[PDB]
Amino acid sequence: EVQFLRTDDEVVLQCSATVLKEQLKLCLAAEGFGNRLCFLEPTSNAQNVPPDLAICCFTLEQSLSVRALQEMLANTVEGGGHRTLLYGHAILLRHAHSRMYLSCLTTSRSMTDKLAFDVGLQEDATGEACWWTMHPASKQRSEGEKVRVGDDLILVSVSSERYLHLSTASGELQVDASFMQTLWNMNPICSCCEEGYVTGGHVLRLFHGHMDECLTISAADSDDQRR
Amino acid sequence: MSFYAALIDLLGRCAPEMHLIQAGKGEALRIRAILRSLVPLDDLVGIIS
Amino acid sequence: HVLDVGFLPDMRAAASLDTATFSTTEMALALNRYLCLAVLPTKCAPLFAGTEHRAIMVDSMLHTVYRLSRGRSLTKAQRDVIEDCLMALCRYIRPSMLQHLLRRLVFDVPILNEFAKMPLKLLTNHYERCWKYYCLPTGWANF
Amino acid sequence: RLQESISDFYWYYSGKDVIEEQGKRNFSKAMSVAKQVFNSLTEYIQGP
Amino acid sequence: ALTEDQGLVVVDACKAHTKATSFCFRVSKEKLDTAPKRDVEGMGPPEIK
Amino acid sequence: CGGERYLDFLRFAVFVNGESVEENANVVVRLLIRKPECFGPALRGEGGS
C-alpha cells in the first residue's frame, strides 16, 4: 500500500527544473564543516555516472503544531516518537551527517535588491529560525491530511516568513529562499531499519579469513598513487 | 510622482504600532525588517533633498 | 537632514502679495517640522539659520498662516530653545530689538512667553557672553 | 477538524494559569457541541 | 571498478560507467544464473546480517 | 492612475483614528510582497532604478 512519511526517518529533498527542456533531477545538500551555505547536487546523469548522496541525507528530528512550537519557544528552558506527519505541522530537518540543523540565515547574494536569505546549516537547534513549516502544493490534498510519499510539498520558514525557492540566475542554480513556492518533492531515502542487519549507506569494513584480514588501499605517500 | 508618494504613504503608515509591540513582540521586528529592506535608507534623503 | 531639509524652504517663499500658489509647501511643515518639534538630541551644520528661519514665521503674518498651524509652528521654536546649549546668541539678538520694544503686541505676546523662558533656563552658572551681557538688561529696561 | 481546533485552544491557554471567564464560557459552548456529536456518533453503531 | 586497462583498480568517480563499477553479492560460489530478478519499493525482508 | 485609487482605499483601512491596526496591516504586507512585484523591474529589484 501507499506508505506515509513517518518521523525519525531519513529523507532527501528533491526538485526539478528545465535548463535544456528536460526535467533535471536535483537535490539539496551542504558540506557542513567548511562552507556552511547549502548548494545544489545534480543527479540527472546517475545512469551514466553516479552522484555523491552521502551529504544529501537529511533526517526528520521531530514535528508538532505551530502553537505548540510557540509554547516550546516560550518554554525555552528544557519518547516513542514516530508520529505521522500532517500538513500544517512545523517540521524540523537535520543533516544526518554533519549533525547541524537546517535553518535560514541573515545574508544576501546576487544583489537582487530584495530578500534572498541564503539557507544554511545552523550549528544548534536553539532559536526559532531553525524550524520550518510544510504546506500543500497540489489542491487534491488540503490541510490536516496525512502526507504521503511522492506528493509535492511547499516548505516555508517560520521566523523568516519566506518560502523555499529554486533560484535560477546567470550562474549555477542557486537554492536561496527568496521568491517562488517551488514544488519540493520529498523522497524517503530510508526509514526504521532492523537491528543487526545491513542497509545501504552504512559504511562497513570487509573482513576475510577468520578475523585477521581487511581489504584496503595502501597508505598515502606511495608509488601506487592509492589505486 | 503621485503613485509612488501614495505607495510609500501606505507602507509608512502600516508600521507596527508606535512603540507598544515594538518593545518586545517579534511580529513587529519581522515586519519592520522586511519594511526597511524594500526602500532602504540613503534614498529618502536624496529624494527629500 | 537639518542641513538639507530645513534649507529647502527659501524662507518658505515668503509672501509679498505676490505668492499664493505654493500654499501647500506651507502645510508641508505639518509633517516635516513635526519631527523637528518631537526630537531633541558642536555646530557641525548651520543651526543658526534654522533658528532665525523659525523666528521669521512666528512673527510673520502677511501670508495666510492658518492660525492652528501658527500654534503648530510656535511649538518648534519653543522646543528648540530648551535643548539648545547656547548656540542661539545670533538669533537671540533679533527678538530683543522688537516685540515689546517695537510694539507688535498682536504678534509678539506668544513670542514674549518664548523669550520669557530663556533666562530662567540659565542661571549665571556655566555661561558668559559680553555681547549678550548688556543686551538683555537694555531690553529689560526698555520693555 | 474540531479536535485540531480545540487542541490549539489548549496550547494558547497552557501558559496562562487562570482562565478568563469569557474563555471558559466559549470553551463550554464548544464542549456541548462536542458532546452532541459523540452521542450521534454512538447511535450509528449501538446495536451490532 | 574494473576498467580493464590494468585490471581490478579503484577509478575516479567521474569515469564510472555503472557496469564496470557495479558489483553484487551472492549466497555462494555455486554457479547460478539468477535470471529472475526481484523488486519492491518498501524495505523488504532483512537477508544479510 | 488606476493604482492610486486602489491604494487610497487601502490607505483608509489602516489609519483609523490615528493608529495602525495590526491584523489588516499584517495581511496587507504579506499580500503586498507578491502582487506588487509588477510596476516594472524598478521597485521589484530585478532592475535597480
Interstrand relation of A10-14 and A101-103 (parallel, antiparallel or unpaired): unpaired
Answer left, alpha or beta for residue F45, where phi above 0 means left and psi between -120 and 50 means alpha: left
Residue B48 Cα, gap to closest chain C Cα (Å): 7
- Give me the residue label for grid cell 503613485: B3
What's chain A's length in residues? 227
Q: Measured between alpha carbons, how far is A13 from A56 in angstroms, rounded to an integer?
A: 8
From A49, A50, A198, residue closest to E48, measured CB to CB: A198
Is C8 close to B49, i.e. CB distance below 8 A? yes
Residue A114 Cα, gap to closest chain B Cα (Å): 6
In terms of Cα–Cα distance, which of F25, A99, A90, A160 is closest to B15? F25
β-partners of residue A122 are: A101
SS3 A64: strand
Specify the experimental method: cryo-EM
Instruction: Please state, as a whole number, how many other Cβ atoms lie within 10 Å of the Cβ of residue C67.
Output: 9
**Packing angle, helices D2-14 and A66-74, rounded to 10:** 10
Is B38 close to A161, i.e. CB distance below 8 A? no
Is F29 close to B31, i.e. CB distance below 8 A? yes
User: Could you tell me which chains touch chain D, where touching means 3 or more CB pairs under 8 A?
Assistant: A
In terms of Cα–Cα distance, which of A137, A102, A127 is closest to A117? A102
Complete DSSP assignment for A138-169: STTS-TTSB-BSS--B--EESSS--B---B--
Backbone angles phi, psi at C109, to 5 degrees: -60, -50
Instruction: Please state, as a whole number, how many other Cβ atoms lie within 10 Å of the Cβ of residue C87.
Output: 12
Chain E residues touching A198 at Cβ < 8 A: 46, 48-49
CA distances for A167 relative to A121, A138, A199, F12, angstroms = 18, 21, 35, 36
Backbone angles phi, psi at C11, to 5 degrees: 60, 30
CA C57 to chain centre: 8
Task: Mark out chain A residues that contact chain F at CB-CB < 8 A.
Answer: 112-114, 161
CB pairs under 8 A between B and F: 45
Continuous H helices in chain C? 24-27, 29-38, 47-59, 67-83, 89-96, 109-121, 130-142
- Specify whether the CB–CB gap between C118 and C136 falls below 8 A: no
Query: What type of residue is A20?
Result: L
Answer left, alpha or beta for residue A88, where phi above 0 means left and psi between -120 and 50 means alpha: left
Chain C residues touching B48 at Cβ < 8 A: 1, 4-5, 8
CA C129 to chain centre: 20
β-partners of residue A29 are: A39
Test mutation, B14, B37, B38, B39, chain F, max F CBs within 10 A: B14
Chain A residues touching F44 at Cβ < 8 A: 114
Which pairs from A154-157 meet CB under 8 Å and 24+ separation?
A: A154/A181, A154/A182, A154/A183, A154/A184, A155/A91, A155/A184, A156/A132, A157/A104, A157/A117, A157/A129, A157/A132, A157/A133
Annotated binding residues of D, written as ranges, equal: 43
In terms of Cα–Cα distance, which of C35, C101, C23, C28 is closest to C64? C23
Positive or negative, the Cα torsion across E26, E30, E31, E35? negative
Is B10 close to F43, i.e. CB distance below 8 A? no
Q: Measured between alpha carbons, how far is C25 from B49 in angstroms, rounded to an integer?
A: 14
Q: Measured between alpha carbons, how far is D42 from D40 in angstroms, rounded to an integer?
A: 5
In terms of Cα–Cα distance, which of A73, A166, A90 is closest to A127? A73
Contacts of D33 by beta carbon, 8 Å cutoff, 6+ apart: D2
From B13, B21, B34, residue closest to F11, measured CB to CB: B13
Write out residues 4-63 of C within 8 Å (CB-CB) of B.
Answer: 4-5, 8
- Specify whether the CB–CB gap between A48 and A33 falls below 8 A: no
Backbone angles phi, psi at A108, to 5 degrees: -155, 160
Resolution (A): 4.1
Chain A residues touching F30 at Cβ < 8 A: 161
Q: Measured between alpha carbons, how far is A5 from A184 in angstroms, rounded to an integer?
A: 14
Is F11 close to B15, i.e. CB distance below 8 A? no
From B2, B15, B16, residue closest to F4, measured CB to CB: B2
Instruction: Read off the C-alpha cell for D9.
Output: 485552544
HEC secondary structure over chain B: CHHHHHHHHHHHHCCCCCCCCCCCCHHHHHHHHHHHHHCCCCCHHHHHC
Contacts of F36 by beta carbon, 8 Å cutoff, 6+ apart: F43
User: CA torsion angle for A50, A51, A56, A60 (degrees, to 10)?
Assistant: -20
Q: Measured between alpha carbons, how far is A95 from A54 in angstroms, rounded to an integer?
A: 10
Q: Where are the beta strands (DSSP E) in chain F?
A: none
SS3 E37: coil
* A68, containing H or E segment: helix A66-74
Q: Measured between alpha carbons, how far is A140 from A131 in angstroms, rounded to an integer?
A: 26
Q: Measured between alpha carbons, how far is C107 from C95 in angstroms, rounded to an integer?
A: 12
In this complex, whether D and E touch, counting 3 or more CB pairs under 8 angstroms, is no
- Specify whether the CB–CB gap between F30 and A162 falls below 8 A: no
DSSP state of F35: G
SS3 A125: coil
- Specify whether the CB–CB gap between A144 and A89 falls below 8 A: no
Residue A206 Cα, gap to closest chain F Cα (Å): 55
Complete DSSP assignment for D3-42: HHHHHHHHHHHHS-SSPPHHHHHHHHHHHHHHHHHHHHHH
CB pairs under 8 A between A and D: 16
